[PDB]
Amino acid sequence: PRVSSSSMPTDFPLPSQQKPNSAVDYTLTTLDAVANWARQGSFWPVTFGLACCAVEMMHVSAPRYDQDRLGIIFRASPRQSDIMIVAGTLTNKMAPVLRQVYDQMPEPRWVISMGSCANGGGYYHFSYSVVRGCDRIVPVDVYVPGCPPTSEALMYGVFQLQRKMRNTKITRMWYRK
Amino acid sequence: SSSLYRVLRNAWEVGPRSYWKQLNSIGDTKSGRLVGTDIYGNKFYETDHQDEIHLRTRYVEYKEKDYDMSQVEPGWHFWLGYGVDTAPCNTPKEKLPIRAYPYKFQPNYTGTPGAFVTYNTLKPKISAWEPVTKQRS
Amino acid sequence: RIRAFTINFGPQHPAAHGVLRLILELSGEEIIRSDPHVGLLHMGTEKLIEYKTYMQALPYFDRLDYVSMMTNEQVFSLAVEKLLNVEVPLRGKYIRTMFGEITRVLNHLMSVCSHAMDVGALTPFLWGFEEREKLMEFYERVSGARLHAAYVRPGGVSQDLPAGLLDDIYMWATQFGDRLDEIEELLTDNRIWKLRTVNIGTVTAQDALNLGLSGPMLRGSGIPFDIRKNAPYDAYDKVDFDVPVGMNGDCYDRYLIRMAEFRQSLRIIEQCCNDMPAGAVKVEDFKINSPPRNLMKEDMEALIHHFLLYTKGYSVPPGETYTAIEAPKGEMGVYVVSDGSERPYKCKIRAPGFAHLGAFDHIARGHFLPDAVAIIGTMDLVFGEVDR
Amino acid sequence: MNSFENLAQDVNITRSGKTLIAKGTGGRSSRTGYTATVFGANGFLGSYLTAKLAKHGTTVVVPYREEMAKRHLKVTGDLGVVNFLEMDLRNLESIDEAVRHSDIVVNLIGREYETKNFNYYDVHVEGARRIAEAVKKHNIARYIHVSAFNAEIDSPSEFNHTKGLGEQVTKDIVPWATIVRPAPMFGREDKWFLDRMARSPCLVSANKFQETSNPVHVIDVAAALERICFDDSTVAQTFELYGPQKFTQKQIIDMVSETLRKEVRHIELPKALYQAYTKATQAIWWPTYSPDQVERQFLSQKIDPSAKTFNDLDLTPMELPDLMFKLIRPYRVNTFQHDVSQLENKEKTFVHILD
Amino acid sequence: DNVPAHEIVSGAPAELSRNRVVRIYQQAKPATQSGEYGTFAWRLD
Amino acid sequence: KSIISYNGNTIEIPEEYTKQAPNRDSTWAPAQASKTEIYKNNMVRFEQKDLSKQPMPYAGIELIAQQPVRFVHGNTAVCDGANHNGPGAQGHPKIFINVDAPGSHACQYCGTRYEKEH
Amino acid sequence: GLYVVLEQFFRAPYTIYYPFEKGPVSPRFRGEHALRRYPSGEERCIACKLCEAICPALAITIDAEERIDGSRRTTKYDIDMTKCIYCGYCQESCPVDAIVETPNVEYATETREELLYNKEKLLANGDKWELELQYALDADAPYR
Amino acid sequence: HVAPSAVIPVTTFLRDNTSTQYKSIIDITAVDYPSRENRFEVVYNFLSVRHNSRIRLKTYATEVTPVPSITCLYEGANWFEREAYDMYGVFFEGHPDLRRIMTDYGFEGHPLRKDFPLTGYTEVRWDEEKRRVVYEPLELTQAFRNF
Amino acid sequence: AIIATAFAETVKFSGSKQELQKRTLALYRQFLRGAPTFADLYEVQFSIPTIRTKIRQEFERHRFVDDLSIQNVLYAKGHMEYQECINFWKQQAQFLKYFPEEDDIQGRHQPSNFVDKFLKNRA
Numbered sequence A: 001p002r003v004s005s006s007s008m009p010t011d012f013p014l015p016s017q018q019k020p021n022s023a024v025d026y027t028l029t030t031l032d033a034v035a036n037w038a039r040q041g042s043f044w045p046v047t048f049g050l051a052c053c054a055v056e057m058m059h060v061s062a063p064r065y066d067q068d069r070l071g072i073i074f075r076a077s078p079r080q081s082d083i084m085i086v087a088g089t090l091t092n093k094m095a096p097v098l099r100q101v102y103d104q105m106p107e108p109r110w111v112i113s114m115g116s117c118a119n120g121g122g123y124y125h126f127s128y129s130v131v132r133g134c135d136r137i138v139p140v141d142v143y144v145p146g147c148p149p150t151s152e153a154l155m156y157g158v159f160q161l162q163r164k165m166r167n168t169k170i171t172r173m174w175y176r177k
Numbered sequence B: 001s002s003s004l005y006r007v008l009r010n011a012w013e014v015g016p017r018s019y020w021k022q023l024n025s026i027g028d029t030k031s032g033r034l035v036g037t038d039i040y041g042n043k044f045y046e047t048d049h050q051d052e053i054h055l056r057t058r059y060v061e062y063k064e065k066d067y068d069m070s071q072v073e074p075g076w077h078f079w080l081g082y083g084v085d086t087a088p089c090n091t092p093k094e095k096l097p098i099r100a101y102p103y104k105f106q107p108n109y110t111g112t113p114g115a116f117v118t119y120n121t122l123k124p125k126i127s128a129w130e131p132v133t134k135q136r137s
Numbered sequence C: 001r002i003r004a005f006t007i008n009f010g011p012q013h014p015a016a017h018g019v020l021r022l023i024l025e026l027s028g029e030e031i032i033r034s035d036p037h038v039g040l041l042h043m044g045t046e047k048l049i050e051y052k053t054y055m056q057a058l059p060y061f062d063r064l065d066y067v068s069m070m071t072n073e074q075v076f077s078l079a080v081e082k083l084l085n086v087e088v089p090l091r092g093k094y095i096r097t098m099f100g101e102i103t104r105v106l107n108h109l110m111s112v113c114s115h116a117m118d119v120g121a122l123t124p125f126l127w128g129f130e131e132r133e134k135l136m137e138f139y140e141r142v143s144g145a146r147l148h149a150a151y152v153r154p155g156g157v158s159q160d161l162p163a164g165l166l167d168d169i170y171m172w173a174t175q176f177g178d179r180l181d182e183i184e185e186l187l188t189d190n191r192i193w194k195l196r197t198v199n200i201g202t203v204t205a206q207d208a209l210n211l212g213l214s215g216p217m218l219r220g221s222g223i224p225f226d227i228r229k230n231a232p233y234d235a236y237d238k239v240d241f242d243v244p245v246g247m248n249g250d251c252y253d254r255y256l257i258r259m260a261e262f263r264q265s266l267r268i269i270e271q272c273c274n275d276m277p278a279g280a281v282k283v284e285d286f287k288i289n290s291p292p293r294n295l296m297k298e299d300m301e302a303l304i305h306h307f308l309l310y311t312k313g314y315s316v317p318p319g320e321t322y323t324a325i326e327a328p329k330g331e332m333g334v335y336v337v338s339d340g341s342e343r344p345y346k347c348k349i350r351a352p353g354f355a356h357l358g359a360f361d362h363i364a365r366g367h368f369l370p371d372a373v374a375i376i377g378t379m380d381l382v383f384g385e386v387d388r
Numbered sequence D: 001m002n003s004f005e006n007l008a009q010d011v012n013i014t015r016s017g018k019t020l021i022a023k024g025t026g027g028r029s030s031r032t033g034y035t036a037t038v039f040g041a042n043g044f045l046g047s048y049l050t051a052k053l054a055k056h057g058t059t060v061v062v063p064y065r066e067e068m069a070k071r072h073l074k075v076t077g078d079l080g081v082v083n084f085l086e087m088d089l090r091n092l093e094s095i096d097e098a099v100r101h102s103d104i105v106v107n108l109i110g111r112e113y114e115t116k117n118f119n120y121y122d123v124h125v126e127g128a129r130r131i132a133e134a135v136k137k138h139n140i141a142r143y144i145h146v147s148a149f150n151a152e153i154d155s156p157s158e159f160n161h162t163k164g165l166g167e168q169v170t171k172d173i174v175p176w177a178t179i180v181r182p183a184p185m186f187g188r189e190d191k192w193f194l195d196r197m198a199r200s201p202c203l204v205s206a207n208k209f210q211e212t213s214n215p216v217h218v219i220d221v222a223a224a225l226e227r228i229c230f231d232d233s234t235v236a237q238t239f240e241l242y243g244p245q246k247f248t249q250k251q252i253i254d255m256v257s258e259t260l261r262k263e264v265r266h267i268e269l270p271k272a273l274y275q276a277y278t279k280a281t282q283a284i285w286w287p288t289y290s291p292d293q294v295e296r297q298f299l300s301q302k303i304d305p306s307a308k309t310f311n312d313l314d315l316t317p318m319e320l321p322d323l324m325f326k327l328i329r330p331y332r333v334n335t336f337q338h339d340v341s342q343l344e345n346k347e348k349t350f351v352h353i354l355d
Numbered sequence E: 001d002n003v004p005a006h007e008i009v010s011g012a013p014a015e016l017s018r019n020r021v022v023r024i025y026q027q028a029k030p031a032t033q034s035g036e037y038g039t040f041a042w043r044l045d
Numbered sequence F: 001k002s003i004i005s006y007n008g009n010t011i012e013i014p015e016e017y018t019k020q021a022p023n024r025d026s027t028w029a030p031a032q033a034s035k036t037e038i039y040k041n042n043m044v045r046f047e048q049k050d051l052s053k054q055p056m057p058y059a060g061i062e063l064i065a066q067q068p069v070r071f072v073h074g075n076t077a078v079c080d081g082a083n084h085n086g087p088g089a090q091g092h093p094k095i096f097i098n099v100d101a102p103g104s105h106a107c108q109y110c111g112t113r114y115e116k117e118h
Numbered sequence G: 001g002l003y004v005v006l007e008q009f010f011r012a013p014y015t016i017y018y019p020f021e022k023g024p025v026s027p028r029f030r031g032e033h034a035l036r037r038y039p040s041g042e043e044r045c046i047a048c049k050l051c052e053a054i055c056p057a058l059a060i061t062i063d064a065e066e067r068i069d070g071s072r073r074t075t076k077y078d079i080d081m082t083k084c085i086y087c088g089y090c091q092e093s094c095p096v097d098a099i100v101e102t103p104n105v106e107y108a109t110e111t112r113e114e115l116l117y118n119k120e121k122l123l124a125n126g127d128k129w130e131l132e133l134q135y136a137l138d139a140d141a142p143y144r
Numbered sequence H: 001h002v003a004p005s006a007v008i009p010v011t012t013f014l015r016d017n018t019s020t021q022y023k024s025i026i027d028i029t030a031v032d033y034p035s036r037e038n039r040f041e042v043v044y045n046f047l048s049v050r051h052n053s054r055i056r057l058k059t060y061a062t063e064v065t066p067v068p069s070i071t072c073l074y075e076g077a078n079w080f081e082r083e084a085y086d087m088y089g090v091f092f093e094g095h096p097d098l099r100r101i102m103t104d105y106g107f108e109g110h111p112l113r114k115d116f117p118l119t120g121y122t123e124v125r126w127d128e129e130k131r132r133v134v135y136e137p138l139e140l141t142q143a144f145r146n147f
Numbered sequence I: 001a002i003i004a005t006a007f008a009e010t011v012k013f014s015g016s017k018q019e020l021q022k023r024t025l026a027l028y029r030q031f032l033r034g035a036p037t038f039a040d041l042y043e044v045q046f047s048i049p050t051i052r053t054k055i056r057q058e059f060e061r062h063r064f065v066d067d068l069s070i071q072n073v074l075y076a077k078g079h080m081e082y083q084e085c086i087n088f089w090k091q092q093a094q095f096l097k098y099f100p101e102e103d104d105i106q107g108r109h110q111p112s113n114f115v116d117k118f119l120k121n122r123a
């Protein structure tokens, strides 16, 4: 008896507004919350992308604003990292190297654009030797404004990114799919 | 100071409920007088102890569990930051801006539907013609 | 036949204070050839400046070095005053001096303490960056911005000092010698620092001159050249200081010179704080410098001048000039050309890190890779400068 | 300068009464006027499609369910071009939102396997009906369904049965619907073809590797959908995008092995055992072959000769044996150099050991 | 003739040479002002 | 409000969000785009978004018509929008308005009006 | 050297907790932009377009026309904060103190189109931060 | 002011003569004056730490007429002449390895020429299809306003 | 001394066409011998013959240039590009700038007569 009907519900709420009410739902919420706790408390960017305006990023590694207190560690290599920070000017002589480093990163992976020269080209927007935005190469999740963005702006941007991953659905979406 | 006597004396000063709240929010224990609360409900304190270095005298205690510094009302965002010695709660009257319009504080709604949508306040510069026809009488 | 092995040091290098594709050719460990590639960060500054007024272009010169902003704009201010044929007021000269030395401190800190970290000593870095972050509060107080600022402008200074700044500077100054000494304790007399810096990057006097090298790279060979003494510009003639010099031309001597420059700059800061004359901080010719606002909102000619300076800008006389300074990196310079317009016709930034990296091939030949790291660290090239 | 290689004119007019004036030369900043909607741009084919649409400034509405698979689409165009909505076939308002302001609609929905929330029927029939009813309500000018090759209303394969029912329902609500019927697509990061023959430890065929088909490069099918979205001659039509050369499974595998210089592993164990092993692997959460696909291993490609083809769009579809090098060179191991002899005498001149 | 073709070494496209027109001129004396300094130079646009 | 899209469909938007500002419906300048033409041209980017939380500041053209007229004895009124409370200028450049003519006269910077006592 | 290291182990760390304790901020600081109003409720911008001319990055984009009441005012005022370098030349040129730069730095986003600020987004930002702007102006104007 | 033939001789005099020990090479720079027949004007700056003095030295060139290289004397001129070539197109005869240093590896053009537009002729984006950073003709979303 | 890199030739402006003929021919020969290296180093998706075809096209471009100085400039620029390519300085993008043709057909309508250009406003 081959299927030839469908009880497909309407009015099924969307993921943003999907509250839990079943034990499977609370369970998947707990597993997602733990995975996201892991993703938040260990937030390791790669040393690449920090060309120009590295001073303000190094000041977030400094005493007054310790990034390591949030579990941030900068790594030499993509393969161990999750996050890329496209600080500074993204020139046309460098974009392919950037895309290599981004494809080399293992999923899950995010991107956070620190500064104006990397968001929309900023000051050198009309130059011959510039990518007018790092969007053109890689997909960006958070845009920090500034030139050079204050250490506090970078920390706040990381606290917006932690929020993005914290309201992420890893298993609940599979229970939808 | 980073010494244990600091946290112990502070936890004697402010009670255990505030201790677990501070441990779940700040990560440190801190005790000080209240200076006032903003329109979002966020409370702002100040310390006088010698143990607290520069830039740690004034602190916040957010209301929402999903805290974000965008939730801090103006004035406080400047007092919290050592821009002024006098808080908006005690700043005199003539120093307060006059408003012909109501106040309405709205945080950074990024990542949520209320994110700011941009648009063009103008209309197309070259207005075209809306056809109408005539007959060859 | 020695056949070589080409390796990239990497455009993605944690150690370098910036991005550099260094193509080395090795026969085992020894370097025999080096081909530093650059332009990975070249933004195109020298062309864009030709489309901007002399005021709109000042911000360009602060982005040419991640550190050392207030000196980098002090070169453009001097060139354009030399063309305009105006004179800066005394208080502006003393401020430009004091902030020039605060800036040399802020650069030598980053430089020495990045050399360390590339050589492995993680700690002096983080013991010094706090001092940098106390010194940047003075920046945010005078300019508004923490790093890239735009305080020094042709004709002097943008705005006067706020009250209660010399006091805080004096406080930091009384406490800074101790922290410099705490750094010297770890680095100076240590064995490993000497092993990594004694007879490395050794360059002779005649070679250092033929290669265009300046600054500590030259003062480590034995030549006492310091533009601040041989050609004083702001107030370095009206304030006492000494210039260290060293033999042997190695990295250790350059490190000692840099620490000596820390302490002598501290001497200068103390003196300038003890004698900051009253008066204006900017030229009193409202055809060059924007007036106050209490006049622009009450006097007609002042509002006109405000309008023109902030639309068309000020007309520099025709001419051309190379003027130079003793920037902490070396002898920085600007070659400006004028055509009677408010927009420059040409502006070449001479960048000491350029000639340093160019000599890197002459300097590294015979040395192993750890020594190449130490060499780039002696020069502490800021590759935004190197790429212009 | 750049070009509008997709458009024949600059002033176009949809069948819904909208005028669409093009602006620019056809680069990142240009605009085609159009507004489309692609229900599976997160996937293998829809990704190449949105890339080709948004390269020229066509506004692209991209319904998504996972926020993180999609981000690789925002790169494909300027700001404001690519627009995202969270959607689900079990919510109707979401579908009306996605299709409201669209001149074009593109349905790429369909899994190669069943799930707990979606059987083959619910996703290939009911989902098509929901989208069709919204395409009809709002009277969208164009609708471009994609229904799998070999589709037939009643067939041993439930997949092809549903795919055939999705065809007739779409065309019985939206008469002006265009239907495309691609054959097995191949390319970089493909689902079940070259990445599998190049990565899978061992292949299996309940038949022999004998199922006959005409495969095709996916970029060309994306070119086809581009050349159909804008050509209004293709209403109430049907297409068979199959490809010039007929290839049996064993032929493809031998070319894959030749190009890879590694011996691909194939087993050829019978039907019921493989069908059972697939059925038991459908309980783990990750996609794997499903009982209905080994059923399709016995169903070679019957081509419908009454439907249009590539040559009705001025296209020259590509050949597998040429492209396999580009697609499989990454897995090429390239063990070492050939025939090191006649190199001792040359190596003898160089210094191999320094002191 | 014998005017060198630096267009070959300029590194620029050829569309400027084959399809694009320039105009050489002096800026007209503005009527909104009475100055004449912006003149005396032959612009190319 | 129900706004007809170009593609023949409709665009429903509530009345509180079609007003050009919370104190004024109409546009105060010929080139200003009315909120309906804005939505009708940009709903792709407004679709799943909340209009309550979008910026909707008050208009000044209506808050300055409410301000009472000021009066003076003479053919001149001087204006300088100075705070008088804090230091510095903090206002707009001095402007001497002629007020001999029968009606009110407004400063060109701020719209404050002045009259000749009648 | 190791003992000089240890003495630091027993000394006060410099670290502050950012979201609960912010770092020093000055009236001269240059962060987010804002368009102010008079106490009357009218806006201060008059489309002198000096901010559009001196801006190094050419971020600003303005278009004015005669308002219905016969005054000079704007219908478009945009800022691309992805072009802005935060120089403060725009708060220096304005002869009415309309455009300003707030001490706010907490305005990061998930999209690049939330950073193309328009007039309405700036007028609300100035309605919001007016008290902070008054503090900074009352202690910065005399030097400016 | 000199001519391209006179560069090596005068530099030898300025490097070796006792009264003029201009041993250090501070800079090399070209400048574009299209109104001239010889549009380019190469500029050497020099320094004498001995006597504490600077001096300049100007020549002229064209897009095809080269200039002698003073790498025979001042090794630091290597990079500066590579710059002036890449920026303006001037050819420094005798140079051991003259190649671009700043501009992109395949860049076609010389930027600081007055005929070269500010923005250049090309731009780069990621093509998801080809999976490659690809160079396309320029198109800006906000055009350059000169003022 | 700052020594020259691998395949560097000193810039030397020949006074005659007869010598530059030889130098250009050596450059062409080196490009051809090195084309397989240009296929290995850059992950190329086409033939070595197609590379040699493009090289022949690029040399036919300036085949009819009789001004000697311009020829010297062209030869120097070509040696620069050979040095850029054979040493692995260029990446794939900067190399496939020279091979637009190999990439897939960009769309359908590529105007070649007037009327299509007019309908696309390119005339």
Ligand SMILES: NC(=O)C1=CN([C@@H]2O[C@H](COP(=O)(O)OP(=O)(O)OC[C@H]3O[C@@H](n4cnc5c(N)ncnc54)[C@H](OP(=O)(O)O)[C@@H]3O)[C@@H](O)[C@H]2O)C=CC1
Residues within 6 Å of the ligand: D039, D040, D041, D042, D043, D044, D045, D046, D064, D065, D066, D069, D088, D089, D107, D108, D109, D110, D111, D112, D118, D123, D146, D147, D148, D149, D182, D183, D184, D185, D186, D191
């Ligand atoms: N690729 C091939 O070889 C062939 C493909 N086809 C047909 O062409 C289309 C191509 O898809 P393909 O390229 O194979 O890559 P996919 O099949 O992975 O594309 C699947 C898309 O459909 C979406 N989708 C699937 N099920 C649902 C659902 N239940 N509700 C909502 N969205 C859903 C997925 O969204 P998400 O990714 O977010 O889960 C994904 O975007 C399919 O219709 C397929 O049947 C036909 C013959 C051969």
Ligand code: SF4
Residues within 6 Å of the ligand: G051, G054, G055, G056, G057, G058, G059, G060, G079, G083, G084, G085, G086, G087, G088, G089, G090, G091
């Ligand atoms: S301060 Fe910012 S907005 Fe103002 S001119 Fe400078 S870059 Fe532009």
Ligand code: SF4
Residues within 6 Å of the ligand: G044, G045, G046, G047, G048, G049, G050, G051, G052, G062, G093, G094, G095, G096, G097, G098, G099
């Ligand atoms: S300078 Fe001030 S008044 Fe003039 S246009 Fe800019 S914001 Fe408006």
Ligand SMILES: [Zn+2]
Residues within 6 Å of the ligand: F079, F080, F081, F092, F095, F107, F108, F109, F110, F111, F112
């Ligand atoms: Zn007034």
